């Protein structure tokens, strides 16, 4: 959170990448480290590989790197996922009055609909188009 591409690369992405070895049917690896604060390492396997096991191995190596990652990065929880890259579908959610703002709806979708779609067998990845609520403390430097 609040980190730049270089800080993310040299503090996470590289550390992870360096623990990736002895992983069967691995054709290649690619990663992006970016300015939102985000890494996205994609290990791609020989066609025919058991995805379940490719996940188990990758994650195994990753557990080695994990405590070398910074607390904040751990605390956001890192994911490991075995999905296709493309979107299968986008499930859109609106409010046909105007009793709920865009923020409001996103929080609904997140705390009420997402987890269960996330747990549905077949569902590689769920991207929330928006953000779940958080208790925001917005500081003022003068008062501080």
């Amino acid at each position: 959170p609040g980190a730049d591409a270089k800080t993310v690369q040299d503090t996470v992405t590289q550390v992870i990448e360096q623990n990736m070895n002895g992983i069967d049917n691995l054709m290649y690896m690619s990663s992006n480290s970016d300015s939102t604060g985000t890494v996205q390492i994609t290990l791609t396997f020989e066609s025919g590989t058991d995805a379940d096991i490719a996940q188990v191995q990758v994650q195994n190596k990753l557990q080695l790197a994990m405590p070398l990652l910074p607390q904040e990065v751990q605390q956001q929880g890192v994911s490991v996922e075995k999905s296709s890259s493309s979107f299968l579908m986008v499930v859109g959610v609106i409010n046909t009055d105007g009793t709920m703002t865009q923020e409001d709806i996103s929080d609904y979708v997140a705390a009420n609909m997402k987890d269960a779609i996330s747990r549905t067998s077949g569902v590689g990845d769920v991207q929330l188009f928006g953000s779940q609520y958080a208790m925001r403390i917005w500081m003022n430097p003068n008062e501080l």
Binding site: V91, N95, Y108, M113, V123, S131, W138
Partner: protein, 96 residues
């Protein structure tokens, strides 16, 4: 609640006055982050983009989602309504 956060006591002064979190910041409920914002047909939206697990069945999976979703509908707040803006599946079904 926000009310409860605002009430947290940062320090008690030399004179005895209280400094509360509300006295140095705007407590408020709002996003984890503010990078993603959707509209549906111009109108304020949210939603979830769904990627099919490796090897999993497109059509079968889609079904499971519509089934789970349907369990959610009855408990929606007033006005809340699901829409179906992008879906790779119905082409498969229709075309077969």
């Amino acid at each position: 609640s926000t009310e409860e956060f605002g009430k947290i006591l940062l320090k008690v002064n030399q004179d005895g006055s209280r400094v509360l979190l509300r006295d140095v910041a705007k407590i408020e409920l709002g996003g984890e982050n503010y990078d993603i914002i959707a509209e549906f047909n111009g109108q304020p939206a949210s939603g979830l983009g769904i990627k099919l697990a490796t090897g999993a069945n497109a059509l079968d999976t889609a079904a499971a989602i519509r089934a789970e979703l349907a369990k959610m509908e009855p408990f929606f707040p007033s006005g809340l309504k699901i829409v179906y803006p992008y879906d790779t599946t119905p082409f498969v079904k229709i075309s077969i």
